[PDB]
Design a protein around this ligand. Structure first.
Ligand code: XQX
Length: 335
């Protein structure tokens, strides 16, 4: 809620030339940097509101650490150029990227990505997020909006199988953004985790969370890229669990035994009515994971073997990103 338009100058150097979208955090603008030779940059302008200010300060700390640790951006976290304050608002200056993977999907009629692009995107996401994991961090908020294309140019053509006209990226290279929720191992882990697009079961059941909850989110990301829509279309925690059970089978009894989240359960089973309005929906929208496959070719079997390991209920059993990078789905890239 900084009031602004094109022509405004921030920090007496950054001239606004375009909007780059908005959120509950505030807004992003594209600027000309008159003190870096006219370079175009993205500036995130944070709401003067306690919650978003705190996230922003923490993001700045994380970005300074990551960018000092990986000065060449070998691991594809967005580069923060600097930060400043403008009429009391925290402003974070980034290298300018292309649009988010969410925005690309929306502008492509919610059609999914092609499997070769998914492979490359999956590999880069696992590599970047594994880098955070090697530096004692958990992202916690991985979703298509927080993965951005480096360059978003595309070509356009009719697809016979899927009914319609389709955009195809020329280069699908990505970077990871949003470090406003990123948490170090030695920091407090909020067991009351706030609103999230994807919610790992150990997060919902409040069993403790750490790096494996990022692996869960990546599994959900990959299925969304594959289908063009999420397999967990809800904002309600109990309904999330109900959808998990249709897609992945019953919650493990040890996780149900351990959880303090008794609101979700009748004795040892989910407290869920399949004949209610919400039950009727869940039953139609959700089905066993492998039934979402669009082909039984070897390549699709390999993606789905990986997704399934990422969506393992038990966060100890769940595949790590180090293991994920060695999975046969990625062999094509290493030939
Ligand atoms: O902190 C975040 C997330 C949590 C919001 N970041 C960093 C600040 N952002 C950007 C950084 C660096 N580059 N960058 C490009 C866009 C961007 C690009 C294109 C569009 N369009 C183009 C026209 N169609 C609509 C979308 C929107 C935003 C957004 C960003 C957004 C992602």
């Amino acid at each position: 809620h900084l009031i602004c338009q094109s022509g405004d100058v921030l920090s007496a150097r950054y001239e606004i030339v375009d909007t780059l979208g908005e959120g509950a955090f505030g807004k992003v603008v594209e600027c000309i940097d008159h003190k870096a030779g006219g370079r175009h940059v993205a500036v995130k302008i944070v709401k003067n509101v306690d919650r978003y200010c705190e996230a922003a300060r923490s993001e700045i700390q994380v970005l300074e650490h990551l960018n000092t640790t990986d000065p060449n951006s070998t691991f594809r976290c967005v580069q923060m150029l600097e930060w400043f304050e403008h009429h009391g608002h925290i402003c974070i200056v980034f290298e300018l990227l292309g649009l988010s993977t969410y925005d690309f999907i929306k502008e492509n009629g919610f059609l999914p990505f092609r499997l070769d692009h998914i492979r490359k995107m999956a590999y880069q996401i696992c590599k970047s997020v594994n880098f955070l994991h090697s530096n004692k961090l958990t992202h916690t908020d991985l979703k298509p909006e927080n993965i951005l294309f480096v360059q978003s140019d595309y070509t356009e053509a009719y697809n016979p199988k899927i009914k319609r006209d389709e955009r195809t990226l020329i280069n699908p290279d990505i970077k990871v953004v949003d470090f406003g929720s990123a948490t170090y191992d030695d920091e407090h882990h909020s067991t009351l985790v706030s609103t999230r697009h994807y919610r790992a079961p150990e997060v919902i059941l409040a069993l403790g969370w750490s790096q494996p909850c990022d692996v869960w989110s990546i599994g959900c990301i990959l299925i969304e890229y594959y289908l063009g829509f999420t397999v967990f279309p809800t904002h309600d925690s109990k309904e999330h669990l109900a959808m998990m059970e249709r897609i992945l089978g019953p919650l493990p009894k040890h996780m149900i035994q351990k959880t303090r989240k008794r609101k979700y359960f009748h004795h040892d089973r989910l407290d869920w009515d399949e004949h209610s309005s919400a039950g009727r929906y869940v039953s139609r929208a959700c089905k066993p994971l492998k039934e979402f496959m669009l082909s039984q070719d070897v390549e699709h079997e390999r993606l789905f073997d990986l997704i399934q390991k990422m969506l393992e209920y038990d966060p100890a059993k769940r595949i790590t990103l180090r293991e994920a990078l060695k999975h046969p789905f990625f062999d094509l890239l290493k030939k």
